[PDB]
C-alpha cells in the first residue's frame, strides 16, 4: 500500500543502500583485489570480485540495490566489461554530493551539476586518448593484455589474444560499412569439451557444431551452399488428427507413424535434388538426420533465421530455395578455409570467414572441461577491446590514472568559472577521487599523501600519460608501463552512473503498492 | 550427538561413565553375587548378577562407555568371568589417571606407561600359575573350577548349580580339545525348586508336546512355522470359514486335509513334526489317530535352537521336505523333564552342540538368576578344555601383580614412572570392590594381603569372617580361576581404557 | 541483510579459523590423541585423521568450509598431511593479526605471503636428497607417515604390511593407489591386526567335500548372474505372493539350472583335460544345491559371493575378461592364476588368488571384533597406502618431523627485504607459521612448547644437521640419523595449499548475511 515519507529522509535511505555495496568493489577493482564473502542462508561459501553476483543470490532492497543490479546487466550486454565499475561510480557520487548540498538546501542544482561534470569529463578524457593503429598487431597486443590481468589471469592471457584480435575485426554489421562496435550476438564464444592448447585453432569466422556430426555427412567444400526449406525440404512437420478415437486400436499405431512418415518425406526431397548443405530452423533429430547422410549431405539443425542469413554471407553463398534456382550472387565468395576436428563421435565444423556480419563463434580449449569455462570468460574481456579499438583507435593510457585525471580536471574549472554552479561541481569532483585513493590503500602508507603528488603531477607533467597505477600506488609513466584502460568501458560506465545517481535524487517517495 | 567444547569429553564424560559402571560389578563380583533390578521395555522384574547382560539391556547414552561395552561382550564369549573384570579394572584406572592429568602429565605419556606395565603384568601371570588340574572326564574336578564363576553370578545354591553345569558340560564331550559357546542351551520351564533343576542332553522343546509316539530311535524332523489351519502351498492356501454353509464342509474336510499334510512330510522323512504354526481342533484329531508326534506351539526361539544343531530349515510354506530341510537326532522319547511332560531329543554323538539344563523355579524370577550362572559357566568350561593352568581364587591373584608392578615404577623411571604406579593401584581396585561389598574399610583389606605377604593365597572373600576381619586361603577351597581368563580380561580391559582416555570434544555445528 | 565492513568484519573470519585449528591442535604425531566424532547418525568414529573429521561433521562457520576445501585438495593428490595443513594456516593468521590491529592493511600482509612462499618452494629443492626405493628405506618413511595420521601402536603394526602392498607394482609410479585398495573386514579374536594377502582376495567362497581345496593351474572364467535363471546378466522376477506361485518358481528353476551346468562341464574338458588342471567359476549371487553337487564332483571350484568390486580387480590380476553369463568362453580369453587356495578363518571364507600375472591389486585383511577398533585400524590403512605410494613415485624425499621447517625459517632472515616493507610483514609472519610443527609436538610431550623450540634453533645453527622435534619423545635430534623422513609430496603440496587459503581469509573484508 501507500507509504509517505518526504524529502531528505528518503534521500539518506538511498545513500545507506548504495555505499555498502560500493565499498568492497571499490577495493576489488584495480590490479589489486578483495573478496566479498556471502554467508548463504543454506550455508556454504560463495565469494566473488563482483558485487552484483552476491546481491542476486540474496539481498535486494528498494532503492539503490535494485538500480545497481539493472544498470550492470545492460553493461554486460554492451561492451562486456565494466560491470564492476558502474556500481562504484553511482554510489560514491550519491554519497559525497548529497549531504552538504542538501543542508545548504538545493537539490535541483545538484542535478544540473551532474550534467556539467558529464560535459567536462567527455572533452578532457578524449584529449588524453592516444591513437594507435589496428593494422599493427604489436600495438593492440599491449592494450588487450591488460584486460586479462585485471581479472588476474596471466596463463591464459596469451591464448585469448591470438584468437580475439583478428576475429572481431572481420565481424561487420549488415550496413556492411562498419566494423566499429560488434556488440554480442554478432560476436560470441561457445566451448567444446576438454581439449588442450595444441587443439586450439584461430577462427575468425563462425563455427556450427550441429553441422557435420558424422563421418558420412559433408567433408570439406571450401564454399558451401545452404538450401532454405521451400522446394527441397518442406515447412511441414507434425501429426494429423483428421479423425481420432481412443476406442480404436489401430489409431494408436496410425498417430505415431504419422510423425515418422512426415520426416521421411522431408528427407527424401534433399536426396532427389542434391544440395550439399541444408538448413532447418524447425530443428531435426538424429533419426531424421540419418536419411540425409546416405546422400552425403550435411544438416544444420537447431538454429534461427538471423544466424542462417549472416552465416550465408560468411559461407560464400546466398539464400536459394533449391539447388536448381540459381540467380545473381549476393556473396560469391566468403569462406577462406573449411576444417573439421573430432572430439568424441561429434564433429565440429570450423569455417574461417573474413569480412561478413556472421555470428563469429570462435573455438577455445581449456586444459580440462572445467577450464573451458574460465577461458570463455577471458575471451569475453578480450573481444571487448577489439570492438573498442575498432570503434575508436583513440584510447586512454589510464590505469586508475584515468579516474584521477578527470577528478583534478574538474577542481581546476570550478575555481575559474566561479558562479552558483561552483559548489555542487566541486562536490562531484571529490567523489571521483575517492576511488583511485582505495587502490593506494592496498599498496600501503598514507593514501592521501601519495594522492597529493598526483595532484601536482596533473597540472605539471601529464594528466594520465604519466599517471598512477594501483599496484605501485605511486606515479609511473603509464604509457611505458603498458597499462591501458579501454576507452569504451570508461565512456559508458561514467554516462550511466550519473543517471542512476540522478534518478535517486529525483525520488522522494517510496510506496510499497 | 550434541556439541562440546573445551575438551570436556576427556575430563567430564570419562568420570561420568566410571560411576555408571560402578556398583553393578563392585558387589556382584567374587564369592557372593548380588541382585540388581532391571525393568525392560516389556516391563517385568529381571535380576542380573552378570556384567555383559546388564549392559545389553541398558541403552548407553554416554559414547565414552560404549567402547567398554564392546570389550565386555568379547569377554562374555571368551571367559564369563573376565567380563566382570573389564568394567572394574577399566573404571578404576581412569579415576586415578584423571589425578595424574592435573599435575601436568600428558594424556599419551601415561598411555605409554600403562602399555609397558600390561606387557609386564602378563610376565607375572606365569608366577601365578599355582597348581595344574584338568580332568574333563571328571565331574568332580570341573565343578570346583567353575565354582568361583557361578558364585559371582548367583546368591543361591552355589554347590548344587555347580554339579548341574559340570554334569552337562563334561558329559557331552569328554574327549574334545575345544568346546562351543552354544554347546549348552538353556530350557526355562516353570515350576518346582531351584535345586530341583536337572540335566538332559540334546534339544528339549519347552513348549507343548502332543501327537502320539510311534518311534524312539527314528528321530527325523522337518521344521516349519507354517500353520496347518488350512495352509498348504502344493494346493491352494485359502481357507473357507467366512461362510456358515462352507465352514461346516470345511471342518469335516480338515480331517482329510491333515492326513495329506502329515503323510507329505513323513514319507520323505519325518516321525516328529516340529510345528511353529498352529494345529487346529480337527487337525489335532487327525495326527492322534495317524500316530505321528507333534511338538506344537513353537516360538521362533524354539525353532531356531532346533535348526542350528540339525540343519533342518523352516519355511512358511508346506511342501514335502528336500534334504536340506530334513534333520536327524540320535533319539527321541517322551519323558518328563523336571516333572513336566515335554519332548527330549538326544545329541551327544550326532554333532553334539546342544545339551540342555532345565532351569526351574515356580516363578521366572528365580530362573534368571541361574540363567546367568550357567550361560557364563559354558564359556568357563571352554577355557579349562584349552588349558590346565590353574590360577588361585579371586582377589588372591590381584595382590601379587600390584607388588611386582610397584617394583616396575622404581626400576623404570621416566614420565611413565607415575603411570606404572596407578597401574598397580588399579589391580587393587578388584579386592577394594570386595571391601566395598563387605562394607568394611578398603584400606584394612589391602593391609592384611600385604602383611602376610602371600601372593597367590590370601584374600578377603565374602564371608561373616569378612565382617570382623580375617584372611583366607582361596588357593585351596574349591575356588579357582584359570590362566587365560585373566590374560584375555586384562588385554581387552587395557584396550578399552586407554582409548576412552584419548577422546576429545565432538565437533559439530 | 546485515553487513560487517573493514577490519571489524575481517576479525569475524580469522577468529573462527583460529578456533577450529585450536580444537584440532590435539592431533598430530603419535604423541597426539584420537578425537571422538559422532555425527547425527550414531556410531563412534574414533579418528585422529583430519580429513575424516572435517567431512563427517564440524563446527559451522564460513571458515569451516575453507579448512575442508583445502583438506579435500590435499587428500586427493597426496593422501597425507591433512592434520598438518590446519595448524600452519592458523599460526599464520595469528601473526597477521598483530600488525593489522596495530593499524595496518590486511592486503599488505597477504602480498608478503606470496613472496615468502616462493622462496620456500625453492628451499625444498635444495634440502631434499634422493633416497632409495628399496623396501627397508620405505619402512622408515612408512613408519613416519602412519604416525602423523594415527597413534603409535596402530602405526607400528601397519609399517611392514603397507610397504609390501605398494612394492608389488610393475614399476608403475603414481602418487596414489587406485586398485590396490581392497577392504576386507572381520570380527575375530585378534582385537587389532592387519594381515598381508598378496593378490586379490574374494569376499566368500563355497566348499564341498569333493571340491578341489588346492588348485595349481586355475583357469578362471568370471561369471555374474546366475545358475538360478538362464539368459541373465541381471536378475529375473519372482513368483511366491500367492500359495500357487511358490510351487511354480521352484519348478521352473529346474529348467533354468539344467541349461546352465552343461556349458561349464564342456568348457572344462577343452581346457584342463578331464580333471588334469583346475577350473574356477565366479558366482556373484546364489548357488543352487543341485549345481553345487555337479560342479564340485566334476573338478570345478565354485565360489559363492563375490562383488562387482572383485570383478574389476580380478580381470587385471588374472588377464581374463569379465562375462556376465555362465556360458562357454574361449581358452584364450580365460585368466590364469597359478594358485587358488581357501583359508577359512572365523565365519568367513577368504579365497585367495596368488601368482598374479599383473600385481596392481593386493589385499589387507582387517581384524577387529569391536566397532571402535575396526574404525581406527581400517582408516589408517587408506591414508597409509597412498602415503608410501607418494614416496615410491617421488625420487627425492625431504627430512621430516619439523626438520625443514626450522631451516627455512632462519634462512629467510629478517630485514632481507627493504622494498616498502610490505614484503617484510609477510616474510616475518610466515617464519612463525612454520614453527607451529615443533610447537605442537612439544605441547603433546613434556616441557614447554617454546622451551624445546629454542633448542631446535640453536642446534640448527650447527650446520650439517637438520634438527626437529622427535615424534616419539618430543626432544631435539638429528632427524636424518634416526631415519624419520617424510615424502616430498606432503611437503610441496602443503605450501601451495596453506598460502592460498589463508590469503583469501584476509581478502574477505565484506561478509553479507
Curated annotation (Swiss-Prot), chain A:
MF terms in GO: ATP binding; ATP hydrolysis activity; ATP-dependent protein folding chaperone; protein folding chaperone; RNA binding; unfolded protein binding
Pfam family, one: Cpn60_TCP1
GO terms, biological process: binding of sperm to zona pellucida; chaperone mediated protein folding independent of cofactor; chaperone-mediated protein folding; positive regulation of protein localization to Cajal body; positive regulation of telomerase RNA localization to Cajal body; positive regulation of telomere maintenance via telomerase; protein folding; protein stabilization
Residues carrying Phosphoserine: 158, 231-232, 240
One cellular component term from this protein's GO annotations in UniProt: microtubule
EC number: 3.6.1.-
Cross-link (Glycyl lysine isopeptide (Lys-Gly) (interchain with G-Cter in SUMO2)): 3, 236-237, 369
Binding site for ATP: 30, 82-84, 399, 470, 485
Modified residues (Phosphotyrosine): 235
Residues reported in the UniProt entry to bind ADP: 30, 82-85, 150-151, 399, 470-471, 485, 490
Keywords: Acetylation, ATP-binding, Chaperone, Cytoplasm, Disease variant, Disulfide bond, Hydrolase, Intellectual disability, Isopeptide bond, Nucleotide-binding, Phosphoprotein, Ubl conjugation
Chemical reaction(s) catalysed: ATP + H2O = ADP + phosphate + H(+)
Medical condition linked: Neurodevelopmental disorder with speech or visual impairment and brain hypomyelination: An autosomal dominant disorder characterized by global developmental delay, impaired intellectual development, poor or absent speech, and brain abnormalities including hypomyelination, cerebellar atrophy, and optic nerve atrophy. Some patients have severe visual impairment, dystonic movements, and seizures.
General function of this protein: Component of the chaperonin-containing T-complex (TRiC), a molecular chaperone complex that assists the folding of actin, tubulin and other proteins upon ATP hydrolysis. The TRiC complex mediates the folding of WRAP53/TCAB1, thereby regulating telomere maintenance. As part of the TRiC complex may play a role in the assembly of BBSome, a complex involved in ciliogenesis regulating transports vesicles to the cilia.
Gene that specifies this protein: CCT3
Curated annotation (Swiss-Prot), chain B:
UniProt main location, coarse: cytoplasm
Keyword match Oxidoreductase: no
Residues the record lists as N6-acetyllysine modifications: 300, 382, 448
Phosphotyrosine sites (modified residues): 12, 487
Enzyme class: hydrolase
Assigned keywords, A-Z: Acetylation, ATP-binding, Cell projection, Chaperone, Cilium, Cytoplasm, Cytoskeleton, Hydrolase, Isopeptide bond, Nucleotide-binding, Phosphoprotein, Ubl conjugation
Single GO biological process annotation from the record: positive regulation of telomerase RNA localization to Cajal body
Residues joined by cross-link Glycyl lysine isopeptide (Lys-Gly) (interchain with G-Cter in SUMO2): 206, 236, 242
Catalytic reaction list: ATP + H2O = ADP + phosphate + H(+)
Protein location: Cytoplasm; Cytoplasm, Cytoskeleton, Microtubule organizing center, Centrosome; Cytoplasm, Cytoskeleton, Cilium basal body
Residues noted as binding ATP in the record, renumbered to the chain: 82-84, 152-153, 394, 481, 486
Superkingdom of this protein's organism: Eukaryota
Binding site for Mg(2+): 81
The protein's assembly and partners: Component of the chaperonin-containing T-complex (TRiC), a hexadecamer composed of two identical back-to-back stacked rings enclosing a protein folding chamber. Each ring is made up of eight different subunits: TCP1/CCT1, CCT2, CCT3, CCT4, CCT5, CCT6A/CCT6, CCT7, CCT8. Interacts with PACRG. Interacts with DNAAF4. Interacts with synaptic plasticity regulator PANTS.
PANTHER family linked to this entry: CHAPERONIN (PTHR11353)
Implicated disorder: De novo genetic variants in nearly every subunit of the TRiC complex, including CCT8, have been found in individuals with a broad spectrum of brain malformations, and clinical phenotypes ranging from mild to severe epilepsy, developmental delay, intellectual disability, ataxia, and other features of cerebral malfunction.
Protein name: T-complex protein 1 subunit theta
Gene transcribed to yield this protein: CCT8
Swiss-Prot record, chain C:
Disorder named in the UniProt entry: De novo genetic variants in nearly every subunit of the TRiC complex, including CCT6A, have been found in individuals with a broad spectrum of brain malformations, and clinical phenotypes ranging from mild to severe epilepsy, developmental delay, intellectual disability, ataxia, and other features of cerebral malfunction.
Crosslink feature (Glycyl lysine isopeptide (Lys-Gly) (interchain with G-Cter in SUMO2)) location: 241
GO CC annotations on file: chaperonin-containing T-complex; cytoplasm; cytosol; extracellular exosome; microtubule
Pfam family, one: Cpn60_TCP1
Binding site for ATP: 29, 81-83, 401-402, 486, 491
Reactions this protein catalyses: ATP + H2O = ADP + phosphate + H(+)
Enzyme Commission number: 3.6.1.-
Residues the record lists as binding Mg(2+): 80
SUPFAM superfamilies noted in UniProt: GroEL apical domain-like, GroEL equatorial domain-like, GroEL-intermediate domain like
A GO MF term: protein folding chaperone
Alphabetical GO biological process terms: chaperone mediated protein folding independent of cofactor; chaperone-mediated protein folding; positive regulation of establishment of protein localization to telomere; positive regulation of protein localization to Cajal body; positive regulation of telomerase RNA localization to Cajal body; positive regulation of telomere maintenance via telomerase; protein folding; protein stabilization
Family: Belongs to the TCP-1 chaperonin family.
Keywords, ordered alphabetically: Acetylation, ATP-binding, Chaperone, Cytoplasm, Hydrolase, Isopeptide bond, Nucleotide-binding, Phosphoprotein, Ubl conjugation
The protein, known as: T-complex protein 1 subunit zeta
Oligomer status and interactors: Component of the chaperonin-containing T-complex (TRiC), a hexadecamer composed of two identical back-to-back stacked rings enclosing a protein folding chamber. Each ring is made up of eight different subunits: TCP1/CCT1, CCT2, CCT3, CCT4, CCT5, CCT6A/CCT6, CCT7, CCT8. Interacts with PACRG.
Binding locations of ADP: 29, 81-84, 148-149, 401, 486
KW Chaperone (keyword) present: yes
Superkingdom of origin: Eukaryota
Record organism: Homo sapiens
CDD domains hit by this protein: TCP1_zeta
Localization (cell): Cytoplasm
Amino acid at each position: 500500500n501507500t507509504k509517505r515519507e518526504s524529502g531528505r529522509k528518503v534521500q539518506s535511505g538511498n545513500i545507506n543502500a548504495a555505499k555498502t555495496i560500493a565499498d568492497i568493489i571499490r577495493t576489488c577493482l584495480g590490479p589489486k583485489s578483495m573478496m566479498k564473502m556471502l554467508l548463504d542462508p543454506m550455508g556454504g561459501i560463495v565469494m566473488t570480485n563482483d558485487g552484483n553476483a552476491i546481491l542476486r543470490e540474496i539481498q535486494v532492497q528498494h532503492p539503490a540495490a535494485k538500480s545497481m543490479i539493472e544498470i550492470s546487466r545492460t553493461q554486460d550486454e554492451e561492451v562486456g566489461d565494466g560491470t564492476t565499475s558502474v556500481i562504484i561510480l553511482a554510489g560514491e557520487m550519491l554519497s559525497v554530493a548529497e549531504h552538504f548540498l542538501e543542508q545548504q538546501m538545493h537539490p535541483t542544482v545538484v542535478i544540473s551539476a551532474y550534467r556539467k561534470a558529464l560535459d567536462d569529463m567527455i572533452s578532457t578524457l578524449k584529449k588524453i586518448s592516444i591513437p594507435v593503429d589496428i593494422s599493427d598487431s604489436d600495438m593492440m597486443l599491449n592494450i588487450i593484455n591488460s584486460s586479462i590481468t585485471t581479472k588476474a589471469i596471466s596463463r591464459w592471457s596469451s591464448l585469448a589474444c591470438n584468437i580475439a584480435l583478428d576475429a572481431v575485426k572481420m565481424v561487420q554489421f549488415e550496413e556492411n560499412g562498419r566494423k566499429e562496435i560488434d556488440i554480442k550476438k554478432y560476436a560470441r564464444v561457445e566451448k567444446i569439451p576438454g581439449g588442450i592448447i595444441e587443439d586450439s585453432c584461430v577462427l575468425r569466422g563462425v563455427m556450427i557444431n550441429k553441422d557435420v556430426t558424422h563421418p558420412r555427412m559433408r567433408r570439406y567444400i571450401k564454399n558451401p551452399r545452404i538450401v532454405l526449406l521451400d522446394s527441397s525440404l518442406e515447412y511441414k512437420k507434425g501429426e494429423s488428427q483428421t479423425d481420432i478415437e481412443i476406442t480404436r486400436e489401430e489409431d494408436f499405431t496410425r498417430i505415431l507413424q504419422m510423425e515418422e512418415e512426415y520426416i521421411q518425406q522431408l528427407c527424401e526431397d534433399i536426396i532427389q535434388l542434391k544440395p550439399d548443405v541444408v538448413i532447418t530452423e524447425k530443428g531435426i533429430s538424429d533419426l531424421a538426420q540419418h536419411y540425409l547422410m546416405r546422400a552425403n549431405i550435411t544438416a544444420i539443425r537447431r538454429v534461427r533465421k538471423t544466424d542462417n542469413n549472416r552465416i550465408a554471407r560468411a559461407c560464400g553463398a546466398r539464400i536459394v530455395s533449391r539447388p536448381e534456382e540459381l540467380r545473381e550472387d549476393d556473396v560469391g565468395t566468403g569462406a577462406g578455409l573449411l576444417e573439421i576436428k573430432k572430439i568424441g563421435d561429434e564433429y565440429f565444423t570450423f569455417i574461417t570467414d573474413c569480412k561478413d556480419p556472421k555470428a563469429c563463434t570462435i573455438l577455445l580449449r581449456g586444459a580440462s572441461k572445467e577450464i573451458l569455462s574460465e577461458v570463455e570468460r577471458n575471451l569475453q574481456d578480450a573481444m571487448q577491446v577489439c570492438r573498442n579499438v575498432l570503434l575508436d583507435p583513440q584510447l586512454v593510457p589510464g590505469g586508475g590514472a584515468s579516474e584521477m585525471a578527470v577528478a583534478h580536471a574538474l577542481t581546476e574549472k570550478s575555481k575559474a568559472m566561479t558562479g552558483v554552479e561552483q559548489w555542487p561541481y566541486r562536490a562531484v569532483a571529490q567523489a571521483l577521487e575517492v576511488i583511485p585513493r582505495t587502490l593506494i590503500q592496498n599498496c600501503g602508507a598514507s593514501t592521501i599523501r601519495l594522492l597529493t603528488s598526483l595532484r601536482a603531477k596533473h597540472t605539471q607533467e601529464n594528466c594520465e600519460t604519466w599517471g598512477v597505477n594501483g599496484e605501485t600506488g605511486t606515479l609511473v609513466d603509464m604509457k611505458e608501463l603498458g597499462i591501458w584502460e579501454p576507452l569504451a568501458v570508461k565512456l559508458q560506465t561514467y554516462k550511466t552512473a550519473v543517471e542512476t545517481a540522478v534518478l535517486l535524487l529525483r525520488i522522494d517517495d517510496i510506496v510499497s503498492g | 550427538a550434541k556439541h562440546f567444547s573445551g575438551l570436556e569429553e576427556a575430563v567430564y564424560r570419562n568420570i561420568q561413565a566410571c560411576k555408571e559402571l560402578a556398583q553393578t560389578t563392585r558387589t556382584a563380583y567374587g564369592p557372593n553375587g548380588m541382585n540388581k533390578m532391571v525393568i525392560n521395555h516389556l516391563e517385568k522384574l529381571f535380576v542380573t548378577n552378570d556384567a555383559a547382560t546388564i549392559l545389553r539391556e541398558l541403552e548407553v547414552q554416554h559414547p565414552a562407555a560404549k567402547m567398554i561395552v564392546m570389550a565386555s561382550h568379547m569377554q562374555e564369549q571368551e571367559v564369563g568371568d573376565g567380563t566382570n573384570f573389564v568394567l572394574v579394572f577399566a573404571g578404576a584406572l581412569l579415576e586415578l589417571a584423571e589425578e595424574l592429568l592435573r599435575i601436568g602429565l600428558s594424556v599419551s605419556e601415561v598411555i605409554e606407561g600403562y602399555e609397558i606395565a600390561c606387557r609386564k603384568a602378563h610376565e607375572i601371570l606365569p608366577n601365578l600359575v599355582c597348581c595344574s588340574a584338568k580332568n574333563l572326564r571328571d565331574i568332580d574336578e570341573v565343578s570346583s573350577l567353575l565354582r568361583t564363576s557361578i558364585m559371582s553370578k548367583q546368591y543361591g545354591n552355589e554347590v548344587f548349580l555347580a554339579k548341574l553345569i559340570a554334569q552337562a558340560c563334561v558329559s557331552i564331550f569328554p574327549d574334545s580339545g575345544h568346546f562351543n559357546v552354544d554347546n549348552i542351551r538353556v530350557c526355562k520351564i516353570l515350576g518346582s525348586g531351584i535345586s530341583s533343576s536337572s540335566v538332559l542332553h540334546g534339544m528339549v522343546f519347552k513348549k507343548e508336546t502332543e501327537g502320539d509316539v510311534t518311534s524312539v530311535k527314528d528321530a527325523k524332523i522337518a521344521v516349519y512355522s507354517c500353520p496347518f489351519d488350512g495352509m498348504i502351498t502344493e494346493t491352494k492356501g485359502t481357507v473357507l470359514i467366512k461362510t456358515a454353509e462352507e465352514l461346516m464342509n470345511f471342518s469335516k474336510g480338515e480331517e482329510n486335509l491333515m492326513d495329506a499334510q502329515v503323510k507329505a512330510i513323513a514319507d520323505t522323512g519325518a516321525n516328529v513334526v516340529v510345528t511353529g504354526g498352529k494345529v487346529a481342533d480337527m487337525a489335532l484329531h487327525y495326527a492322534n489317530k495317524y500316530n505321528i508326534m507333534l511338538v506344537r506351539l513353537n516360538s521362533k526361539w524354539d525353532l531356531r535352537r532346533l535348526c542350528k544343531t540339525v540343519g533342518a530349515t523352516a519355511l512358511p510354506r508346506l511342501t514335502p521336505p528336500v534334504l536340506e530341510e530334513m534333520g536327524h537326532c540320535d533319539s527321541v522319547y517322551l519323558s518328563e523333564v523336571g516333572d513336566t511332560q515335554v519332548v527330549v531329543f538326544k545329541h551327544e554323538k550326532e554333532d553334539g552342540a546342544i545339551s540342555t539344563i532345565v532351569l526351574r523355579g515356580s516363578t521366572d524370577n528365580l530362573m534368571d538368576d541361574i540363567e546367568r550362572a550357567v550361560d557364563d559357566g559354558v564359556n568357563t568350561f571352554k577355557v579349562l578344555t584349552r588349558d590346565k593352568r590353574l590360577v588361585p581364587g579371586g582377589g588372591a591373584t590381584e595382590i601379587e601383580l600390584a607388588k611386582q608392578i610397584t617394583s616396575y615404577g622404581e626400576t623404570c623411571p621416566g614420565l611413565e614412572q607415575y603411570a606404572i604406579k596407578k597401574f598397580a593401584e588399579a589391580f587393587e581396585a578388584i579386592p577394594r570392590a570386595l571391601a566395598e561389598n563387605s562394607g568394611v574399610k578398603a584400606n584394612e583389606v589391602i593391609s592384611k594381603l600385604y602383611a602376610v605377604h602371600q601372593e597367590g593365597n590370601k584374600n578377603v572373600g565374602l564371608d561373616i569372617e569378612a565382617e570382623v576381619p580375617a584372611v583366607k586361603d582361596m588357593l585351596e577351597a574349591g575356588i579357582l580361576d584359570t590362566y587365560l581368563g585373566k590374560y584375555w580380561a586384562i588385554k581387552l580391559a587395557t584396550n578399552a581404557a586407554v582409548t576412552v582416555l584419548r577422546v576429545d570434544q565432538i565437533i559439530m555445528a | 541483510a546485515e553487513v560487517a565492513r573493514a577490519q571489524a568484519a575481517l576479525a569475524v573470519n580469522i577468529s573462527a579459523a583460529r578456533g577450529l585449528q585450536d580444537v584440532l591442535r590435539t592431533n598430530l604425531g603419535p604423541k597426539g590423541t584420537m578425537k571422538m566424532l559422532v555425527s547425527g547418525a550414531g556410531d563412534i568414529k574414533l579418528t585422529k585423521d583430519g580429513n575424516v573429521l572435517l567431512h563427517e561433521m564440524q563446527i559451522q562457520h564460513p571458515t569451516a568450509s575453507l579448512i575442508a576445501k583445502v583438506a579435500t585438495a590435499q587428500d586427493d593428490i597426496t593422501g597425507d598431511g591433512t592434520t598438518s595443513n590446519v595448524l600452519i594456516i592458523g599460526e599464520l593468521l595469528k601473526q597477521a593479526d598483530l600488525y593489522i590491529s596495530e593499524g595496518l592493511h590486511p592486503r599488505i600482509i597477504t602480498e608478503g605471503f606470496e613472496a615468502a612462499k616462493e622462496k620456500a618452494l625453492q628451499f625444498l629443492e635444495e634440502v631434499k636428497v634422493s633416497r632409495e626405493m628399496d623396501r627397508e628405506t620405505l619402512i622408515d618413511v612408512a613408519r613416519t607417515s602412519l604416525r602423523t595420521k594415527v597413534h603409535a601402536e596402530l602405526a607400528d603394526v601397519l609399517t611392514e604390511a603397507v610397504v609390501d602392498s605398494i612394492l608389488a607394482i610393475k614399476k608403475q609410479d603414481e602418487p596414489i593407489d587406485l586398485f590396490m585398495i581392497e577392504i576386507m573386514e572381520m570380527k575375530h579374536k585378534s582385537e587389532t591386526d592387519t594381515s598381508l594377502i598378496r593378490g586379490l582376495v574374494l569376499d566368500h567362497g563355497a566348499r564341498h567335500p569333493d571340491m578341489k581345496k588346492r588348485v595349481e593351474d586355475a583357469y578362471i572364467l568370471t561369471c555374474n548372474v546366475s545358475l538360478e535363471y538362464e539368459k541373465t546378466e541381471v536378475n529375473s522376477g519372482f513368483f511366491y505372493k500367492s500359495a500357487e506361485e511358490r510351487e511354480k518358481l521352484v519348478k521352473a528353476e529346474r529348467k533354468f539350472i539344467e541349461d546352465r551346468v552343461k556349458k561349464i562341464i564342456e568348457l572344462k574338458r577343452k581346457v584342463c583335460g578331464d580333471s588334469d588342471k583346475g577350473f574356477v567359476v565366479i558366482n556373484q549371487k546364489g548357488i543352487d544345491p543341485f549345481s553345487l553337487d555337479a560342479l564340485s564332483k566334476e573338478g570345478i571350484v565354485a565360489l559363492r559371493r563375490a562383488k562387482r568390486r572383485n570383478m574389476e580387480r580380478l580381470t587385471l590380476a588374472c588377464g581374463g575378461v569379465a562375462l556376465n553369463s555362465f556360458d562357454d568362453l574361449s581358452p584364450d580369453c580365460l585368466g590364469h592364476a597359478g594358485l587358488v587356495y581357501e583359508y577359512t578363518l572365523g565365519e568367513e571364507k577368504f579365497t585367495f588368488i596368488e601368482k598374479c600375472n599383473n600385481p596392481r591389486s593386493v589385499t589387507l585383511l582387517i581384524k577387529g571384533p569391536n566397532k571402535h577398533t575396526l574404525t581406527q585400524i581400517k582408516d589408517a590403512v587408506r591414508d597409509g597406502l597412498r602415503a608410501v605410494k607418494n614416496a615410491i613415485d617421488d625420487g627425492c624425499v625431504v627430512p621430516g618431523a619439523g626438520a625443514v621447517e626450522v631451516a627455512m625459517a632462519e634462512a629467510l632472515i629478517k630485514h632481507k627485504p627493504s622494498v616498502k616493507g610490505r614484503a617484510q610483514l609477510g616474510v616475518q609472519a610466515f617464519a612463525d607459521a612454520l614453527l607451529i610443527i615443533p610447537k605442537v609436538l612439544a605441547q603433546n610431550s613434556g616441557f614447554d612448547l617454546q622451551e624445546t623450540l629454542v633448542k631446535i634453533q640453536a642446534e640448527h645453527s650447527e650446520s650439517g644437521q637438520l634438527v626437529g622435534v622427535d615424534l616419539n619423545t618430543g626432544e631435539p635430534m638429528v632427524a636424518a640419523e634416526v631415519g624419520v623422513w617424510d615424502n616430498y609430496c606432503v611437503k610441496k603440496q602443503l605450501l601451495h595449499s596453506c598460502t592460498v587459503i589463508a590469503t583469501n581469509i584476509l581478502l574477505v573484508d565484506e561478509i553479507m548475511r
